[PDB]
Amino acid sequence: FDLYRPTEEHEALREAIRSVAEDKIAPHAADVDEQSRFPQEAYEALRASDFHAPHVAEEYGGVGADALATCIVIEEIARVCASSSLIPAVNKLGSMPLILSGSDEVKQRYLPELASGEAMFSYGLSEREAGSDTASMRTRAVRDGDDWILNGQKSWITNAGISKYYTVMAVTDPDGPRGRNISAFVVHIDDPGFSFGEPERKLGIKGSPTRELIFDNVRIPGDRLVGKVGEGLRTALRTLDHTRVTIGAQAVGIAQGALDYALGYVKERKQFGKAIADFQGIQFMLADMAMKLEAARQMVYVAAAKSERDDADLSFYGAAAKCFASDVAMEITTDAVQLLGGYGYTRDYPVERMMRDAKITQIYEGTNQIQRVVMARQLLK
């Protein structure tokens, strides 16, 4: 009766990534956060064992991992270092427009490099004046001969400056129909006229660089185009249906690492002659954490399986899984800090970082408010 559980191969993949995460990634998490620096140790351990971008097809030298497997990887990394979890998460986000809409030549040019881990990918959608409202973006791409000239800026780009390649969405016709006048392009770190802004000072995922892309007449070849002229936003949003699920998986992981730490702590700590775990009010809190986490985890796995089959209701299930899991992670991390008392408020324990990191999950890949707008559209048609 193999209903409603991961396969044996998924559970073996879980032990393998857990093992890389606990030995190679976890030891460096406090320092990655404290110095706001890229988790280089984690990148190298993920690259050595093929967990840095597992979703890439075997045809390109990839692992060809399914959508649920990929979620388990991101979850198990996020359990110990949220910044590190963004290596596979943003590698998927940036590459997915190619995998969904790109020509065989574009795929063949870029995906092998991701597969071997010589290159990381970023995704450039958001701007200063168009975050949630992606259709109002102002970055322009103009034909010049067979070339494209890009002008404008993207905001908030994860792994910017480290990533070699940048999937960038830009207006290809300012008079074309709203939502359908935008195209996707691969931009290289060394393209002319392309700079980065100063790194953001953030609440959490501090080791993940977050920076503006600035495009000053960036000339790029015509073969940088991903899919069809004007179909770029369509591709960028179809991407978010799949990747929202991985941010759900991240939130679950962050929540799980916080619960693991709090549980271990309250079994050991004694006040009034008893373990903190022996107080029923604490038991009730722990039960609530565990029950909500498990509900979020299963809902993520249901959405991941939907992502793998491309089920017609993926839009609702990806928004619900991401929203739910991020809300739950926010509550659980806040409670994990609480359960350690004074100690939980200090950087000597990891729970305060986990609380800081959880808060991003409610904002990126579409604010939980936008998630609710998307869920309501699906219920009402």
Place this chain on the structure above:
Amino acid sequence: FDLYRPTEEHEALREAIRSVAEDKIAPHAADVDEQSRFPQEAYEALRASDFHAPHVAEEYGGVGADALATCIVIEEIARVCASSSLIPAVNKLGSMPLILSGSDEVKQRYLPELASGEAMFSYGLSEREAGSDTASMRTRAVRDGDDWILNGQKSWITNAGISKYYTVMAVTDPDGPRGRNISAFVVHIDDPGFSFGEPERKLGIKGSPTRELIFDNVRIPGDRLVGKVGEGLRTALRTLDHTRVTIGAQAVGIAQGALDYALGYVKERKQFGKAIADFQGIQFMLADMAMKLEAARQMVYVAAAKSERDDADLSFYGAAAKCFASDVAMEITTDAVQLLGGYGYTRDYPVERMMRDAKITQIYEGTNQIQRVVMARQLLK
């Protein structure tokens, strides 16, 4: 990729029970509640299509439906009439101690009658002074020759007076070790010295009779014994691991029928020139309802599959699924009443009954407080 969904056979069973529920059961739900009377129409339609006790093995003339199938049946009935959903739910609860612990002869005597629907089952555990604290029960069974003599009372028995057979737990040794001095017996409606109390006046599931069993020197044969002397509480609690999941499935159904009604209503109703559904604050409420329901539904299906395999962690997952789904159903029904305004507060719409019925799901088969005690034990060992 058949991960994290019901089988095609489960979806065909869903359309069949939905069809019986909408045509034969739903039309009578308001009257079942209003007159506090047994849903006889529903019993007859469930019996005619083999949904009154689907879990019984084919060996006994049953459907031999798996634990998830059984949950979908209870869910789809509970969508339209919570009182009716208790026909399969309490049939399982009452029969499960036989299925788990009874001899071939006991099973062969009672299960065929349930399978054909000539008999309903009830379960007698709780007492006046021992609800949550089952191990402190005072109903006694004393050997007399080969017979047993039962003395005491059970409280709160669902389908009492309608059920022909009663799985009753009683102390078989007042000096034996706590938790392990209790046995299970099948009691017939016509056994000597056995009466019922006056029906409870309840908030909801009003058509489901709820009554005390009174045992005044009830003489019954030695072959009424279910499993082993002293192992009765062990069996009764193992039962609740499986059946807690069906109360989760019930809560989901109640919540789903309330959301279906509220959605339909807010698309039609206009204030300030627009459909109520067009107000973003209402959209956010509806999204929250739908997202929480879906998280509860999936968590129930994960627990049901665990019930079918008898996974070692069933105890945690059944308590979490039941607790979560009942909490969520309470919130959603309260919000469904709200979304209809004045109309939602009247018995002309079904949402107020659905709110009243949802509240029981937080109390029976173990209060949500006891669910949290059980979940905390499992996390801490």
Place this chain on the structure above:
Amino acid sequence: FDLYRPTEEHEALREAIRSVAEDKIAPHAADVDEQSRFPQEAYEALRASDFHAPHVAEEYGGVGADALATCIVIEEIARVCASSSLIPAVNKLGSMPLILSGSDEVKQRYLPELASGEAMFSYGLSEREAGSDTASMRTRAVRDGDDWILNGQKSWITNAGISKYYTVMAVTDPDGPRGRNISAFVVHIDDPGFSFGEPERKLGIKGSPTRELIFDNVRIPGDRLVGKVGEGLRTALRTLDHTRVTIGAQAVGIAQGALDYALGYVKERKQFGKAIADFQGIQFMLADMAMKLEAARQMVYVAAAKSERDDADLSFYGAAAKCFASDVAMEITTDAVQLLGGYGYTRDYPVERMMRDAKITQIYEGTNQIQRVVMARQLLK
């Protein structure tokens, strides 16, 4: 230091109404609910001790109680019978348009009768197609000589059929400016062409009659007019600024009676060898109930004092106090049912009625959704 408490005279008024409520009103509450019948015993005890309409000015034979005193009365009644609390609450709601906008002659005609308790008042604003959207009402009043002719219907009128007088809002010019084409009139129970609909079957406040007013060419004298032609909605909404606070006071009372009962119960009931109150998870629940109730109570008193002074920010504080206190009452009553276990789900204990009654407080005098619309307008200008 007389800051942030009621006066000694308010505390003496509290003991007097508590005393009338516990002896004369409470004994009949279960029967008032069970038979859906008017609380006649309560009306007579409130009339005998001047608590049926205490807000009326001494100039009219009234008690001239301030807005906070009036809230304490409604609170202390609502502690034992929510239906009874609506005698002073709807007496205020119906009379307030006269007190605020009526001529000396209108006041002199109607308020003395309320003061002595020969007459109850109702308020007719809502319609079938205009609840929340009051400005879209369709009840019309047309001049004919010096008379007015009323045509249409009002929905959901509390104490209808018992009340002698009806403050009714109607369109006095279908071409006039939206919001400012409506007038208020006093309608007598015996006016020609005036009938009532069949009583609503409700979830709670079942002893309070709730019925449609039907106006079939109701001819009434020109001196029935309350304030100025077209200024009627302005008066009706100014009323709701004051009266929303009394529904806050009601919710507090309902919540307080539920907490009183649950506390008393969990001190007495024993499971597992201890009082239910000795379990820390229950302690935490009780603390949460008590803390939220007290926050709602104080916020109501702050709004009541604002109502008495007519502070400029009353609109925000009345909506916030009503919304908060009703949300809190809904949660507390739901938890009070839970704390009694099985017993809490039966009509032999009063907590289930208190839960049913609490739910109305989230809907009338402006849905909590409308309360949030009003609060957001005030924050944003």
Place this chain on the structure above:
Amino acid sequence: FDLYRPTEEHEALREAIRSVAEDKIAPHAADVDEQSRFPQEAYEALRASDFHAPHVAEEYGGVGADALATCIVIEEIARVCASSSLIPAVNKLGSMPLILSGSDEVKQRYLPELASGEAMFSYGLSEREAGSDTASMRTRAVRDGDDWILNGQKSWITNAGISKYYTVMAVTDPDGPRGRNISAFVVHIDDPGFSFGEPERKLGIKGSPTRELIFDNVRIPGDRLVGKVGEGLRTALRTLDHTRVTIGAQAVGIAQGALDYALGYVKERKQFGKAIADFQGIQFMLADMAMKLEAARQMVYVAAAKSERDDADLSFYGAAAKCFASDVAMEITTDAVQLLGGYGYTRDYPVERMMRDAKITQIYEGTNQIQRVVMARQLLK
């Protein structure tokens, strides 16, 4: 009708502290947090206008401000800089054992210095192995001639290293009765054998130093004793009844500054052609923030007035106000971050610091869990 509001003198004090806070304190808040350094600018502006310790009696050169006035000061500072708010809050916490239990000579020695602002006070209760469980503390004070010798350690001391004087609680008889074998002493920064630990690295209130006190045979005169031998814990806990209210006032302030910023932001920011404030889902969020804040604020003022009169139920009201206001501040700050989107997650806006600072309010002066233990004791006796 002067019910349920601050006096005119309280509102004039509010404008004066608001004015000092916005001009002299607010400009430095981001840098105080970013460099984890003491808010020296704020100390000097508070000292110049007599807001650094306003509660001290005029008899000692103080302002003699009442308990509500003192709460408004802490609230208005906390609106712009939570670290700065702890100057008056910890000055009160440290001095209160003297004000409540100290001799005229002890008061005359220490309070004038606080009043003029030449000295700050700290309070040393908590230890490594006794936080919540204060009665189990192990710091010892032993008589030697007329002197006392202190040995042990205190944990988590706010303003340690800056404060000149330290009210320290220590065991004065290890064989005496639990709870009643402890005394309070004033310790000077230059007493022999007294050192500080390395400053804690914290989530928030980073400019407030938090450090261990280490006592290595600290010899101090007999006249350092505050009140009576063995009555020290009694005094320390009576203190917390008053000071818990100021942490409520702090939380309110933090919440208010976060709401002020979010409101201002959502009126200006446009997506999809409209101000973010024009989206009803955002309106509902803002209403909820404002309504909960106001309920917390009033409940704090009610508790402050109780603190000023020393009402018999202060214990319940101080725990409820502190718990409620800190829970509400945690939710509101989390929502304020959310309402700014990406910007809210960066240190260029103050909302993320406000979220980090709010979390401490749930932990110090007694964890919200301990607050619930205290509230349940008061309800149940």
